[PDB]
Amino acid sequence: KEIRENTCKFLIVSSTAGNKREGVLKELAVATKVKKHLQDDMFIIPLAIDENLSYDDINIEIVRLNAIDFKKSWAKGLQDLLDAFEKQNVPKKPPDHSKS
Amino acid sequence: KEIRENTCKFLIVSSTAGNKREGVLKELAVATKVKKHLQDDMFIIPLAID
Amino acid sequence: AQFHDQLKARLLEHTIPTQILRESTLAWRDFKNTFGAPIRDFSKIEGHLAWTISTAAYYKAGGKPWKLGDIRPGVCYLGLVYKKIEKSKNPQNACCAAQMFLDNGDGTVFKGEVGPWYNPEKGEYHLKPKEAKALLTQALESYKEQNKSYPKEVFIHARTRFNDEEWNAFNEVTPKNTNLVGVTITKSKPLKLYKTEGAFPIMRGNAYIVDEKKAFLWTLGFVPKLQSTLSMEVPNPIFIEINKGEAEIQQVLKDILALTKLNYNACIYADGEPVTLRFANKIGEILTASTEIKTPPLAFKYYI
Amino acid sequence: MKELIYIEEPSILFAHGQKCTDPRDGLALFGPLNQIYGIKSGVVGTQKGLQIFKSYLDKIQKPIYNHNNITRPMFPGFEAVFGCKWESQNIVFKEITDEEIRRYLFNASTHKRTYDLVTLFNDKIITANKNDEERVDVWFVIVP
Amino acid sequence: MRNKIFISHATPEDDDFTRWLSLKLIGLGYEVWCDILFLDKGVDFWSTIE
Numbered sequence: 001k002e003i004r005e006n007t008c009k010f011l012i013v014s015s016t017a018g019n020k021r022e023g024v025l026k027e028l029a030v031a032t033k034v035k036k037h038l039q040d041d042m043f044i045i046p047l048a049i050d051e052n053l054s055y056d057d058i059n060i061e062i063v064r065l066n067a068i069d070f071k072k073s074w075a076k077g078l079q080d081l082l083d084a085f086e087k088q089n090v091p092k093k094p095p096d097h098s099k100s
Numbered sequence: 101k102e103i104r105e106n107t108c109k110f111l112i113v114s115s116t117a118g119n120k121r122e123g124v125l126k127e128l129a130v131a132t133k134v135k136k137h138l139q140d141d142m143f144i145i146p147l148a149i150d
Numbered sequence: 151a152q153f154h155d156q157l158k159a160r161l162l163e164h165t166i167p168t169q170i171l172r173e174s175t176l177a178w179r180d181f182k183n184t185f186g187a188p189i190r191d192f193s194k195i196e197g198h199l200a201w202t203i204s205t206a207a208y209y210k211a212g213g214k215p216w217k218l219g220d221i222r223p224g225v226c227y228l229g230l231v232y233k234k235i236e237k238s239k240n241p242q243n244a245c246c247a248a249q250m251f252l253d254n255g256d257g258t259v260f261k262g263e264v265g266p267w268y269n270p271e272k273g274e275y276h277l278k279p280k281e282a283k284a285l286l287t288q289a290l291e292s293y294k295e296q297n298k299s300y301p302k303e304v305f306i307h308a309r310t311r312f313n314d315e316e317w318n319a320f321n322e323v324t325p326k327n328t329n330l331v332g333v334t335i336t337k338s339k340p341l342k343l344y345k346t347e348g349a350f351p352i353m354r355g356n357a358y359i360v361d362e363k364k365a366f367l368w369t370l371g372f373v374p375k376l377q378s379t380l381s382m383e384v385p386n387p388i389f390i391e392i393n394k395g396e397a398e399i400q401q402v403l404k405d406i407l408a409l410t411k412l413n414y415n416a417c418i419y420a421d422g423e424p425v426t427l428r429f430a431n432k433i434g435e436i437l438t439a440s441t442e443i444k445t446p447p448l449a450f451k452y453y454i
Numbered sequence: 455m456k457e458l459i460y461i462e463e464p465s466i467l468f469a470h471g472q473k474c475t476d477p478r479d480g481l482a483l484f485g486p487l488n489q490i491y492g493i494k495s496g497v498v499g500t501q502k503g504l505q506i507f508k509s510y511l512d513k514i515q516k517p518i519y520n521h522n523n524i525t526r527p528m529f530p531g532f533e534a535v536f537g538c539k540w541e542s543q544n545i546v547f548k549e550i551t552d553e554e555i556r557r558y559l560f561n562a563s564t565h566k567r568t569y570d571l572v573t574l575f576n577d578k579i580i581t582a583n584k585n586d587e588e589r590v591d592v593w594f595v596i597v598p
Numbered sequence: 599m600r601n602k603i604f605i606s607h608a609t610p611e612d613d614d615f616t617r618w619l620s621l622k623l624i625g626l627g628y629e630v631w632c633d634i635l636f637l638d639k640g641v642d643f644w645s646t647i648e
């Protein structure tokens with residue numbers, strides 16, 4: 001349902017042991033196939049958290065892509081993620097903390 | 101196994117459509133990463149055919 | 151012994167915030183085992199250390215971490231506790247006004263009152279009739295100036311019951327026909343009780359009424375959200391007695407329960423006694439360190 | 455038969471007109487009410503105190519993990535929770551006495567030692583506040 | 599057609615000079631492209647810039 005019919009972007013997370021998990025790799029291959037299907041703007045936006053994960057030893061299929069850094073401070077990562085999102089002209093909605 | 105433990109040289113080629121193929125680009129990206137790791141510039145030998 | 155007390159007391163005259171940090175908290179690595187027994191340890195608790203410090207410093211910067219909004223507008227509040235100075239003639243006379251809550255339209259006031267009024271007696275505590283009139287009048291003009299009108303209802307906390315004459319004087323300085331009531335709150339009284347089944351103590355928030363006047367409350371159980379006890383052993387409750395006035399027991403009991411989480415100096419979920427009594431207790435030893443000060447400030451940033 | 459009446463927990467207010475019971479998760483979700491963002495600070499002590507304070511100050515930016523999550527809510531970061539800047543590059547340090555003429559030879563009447571300590575610290579702080587230009591907000595004192 | 603101006607530099611040492619130059623040039627009106635005015639993710643590390 002959602003990955004094909006009702007998805008706009010993607011937020012893969014590159015942890016230390018994220019490469020081991022077979023399910024995340026399977027859904028990653030699904031995302032790669034749907035990107036090969038669409039070819040409109042971009043779908044995949046990686047994230048990096050750990051300090052042990054060196055910038056070169058990242059998952060092999062994703063070496064081609066860069067990553068916004070979170071190793072220093074989460075606030076700036078959230079800030080540049082959000083302003084990149086709003087620059088990408090994603091449809092908006094008025095905020096409501098009550099739902100949260 | 102190989103590109104990290106059992107690889108010595110590299111023989112990338114250059115066709116008229118090699119620059120538009122994702123597999124070769126991914127492989128050469130990994131090759132450059134491992135050449136930075138291995139501190140030796142004698143890793144890839146490009147080929148021109150067409 | 152009096153290092154911090156003396157330092158803050160004498161620096162109080164220049165209006166400068168300060169914060170004292172022991173080095174062992176900062177350097178808990180290298181102070182390891184001398185001969186096989188580690189001196190010191192914060193591994194298990196390490197993250198919480200940050201939660202203990204940051205917000206406190208924030209308050210010293212001028213920030214408000216969190217405010218309580220379960221107060222009926224147009225009401226009062228106040229507390230009191232005594233202190234022994236035993237300077238020359240072993241005087242017992244040191245009364246430090248704790249605080250007061252006010253609704254100035256939208257905000258909450260947390261400045262309190264000050265002034266260590268004296269008393270010739272050395273062991274009987276209580277208060278001479280002259281000081282109490284000024285003590286209550288002070289809160290009266292504070293309410294007038296922060297309310298642009300007169301206060302409606304007044305509550306008072308205490309620690310010990312008191313005789314008839316000074317409460318009569320308190321009623322004498324009452325403007326119009328406003329209701330005044332004071333509540334005595336002890337700390338320790340033995341009513342140890344157990345749980346019949348399981349291996350856990352009583353669950354926090356219970357009560358046991360013995361009469362329309364007296365009451366009890368428990369504060370150290372274990373919140374289901376925290377799922378773990380607030381005290382290592384079985385707890386000890388707080389005994390409540392109403393001295394004078396016409397006050398309903400349940401409303402005052404829930405009010406005094408609601409004022410045990412405003413511990414700005416920390417961030418623990420629950421605290422035993424209300425903020426007022428301990429808060430006046432911890433301001434008293436600041437002013438008892440040295441008595442040459444005249445008209446100290448009434449903002450608790452510098453005290454804490 | 456005598457029975458126990460139960461009393462429920464109250465609620466505290468937070469930013470954006472939200473409510474909760476615990477304050478930690480509320481701060482992690484909504485933040486404080488008033489926004490103040492200046493922590494230009496001050497410090498006195500010895501140089502090892504300087505380096506250790508710098509290390510601890512720039513360490514807190516990264517999240518630090520408790521041993522047990524279910525009892526202690528997580529701490530992501532000072533800027534993550536408060537929206538206020540506090541770094542280890544804008545301190546105005548004033549040097550402390552190092553000779554410390556007081557030694558094991560001098561231990562009678564420790565009250566005098568305490569008086570000398572407090573006089574030194576207080577005069578240093580007062581002189582720094584009165585004479586210098588930079589606007590300091592808080593003063594941290596560290597000593598073994 | 600040919601309107602934009604490329605600017606290259608070394609990221610980890612100097613960024614302030616490049617930022618000031620980009621701001622000044624965009625203030626004068628000339629269109630500017632550099633290492634900090636691209637999409638948050640490229641297709642590759644390089645392919646986009648070349």
Ligand SMILES: [Mg+2]
Nearest residue numbers: 169170415454
């Ligand atoms: Mg303190």
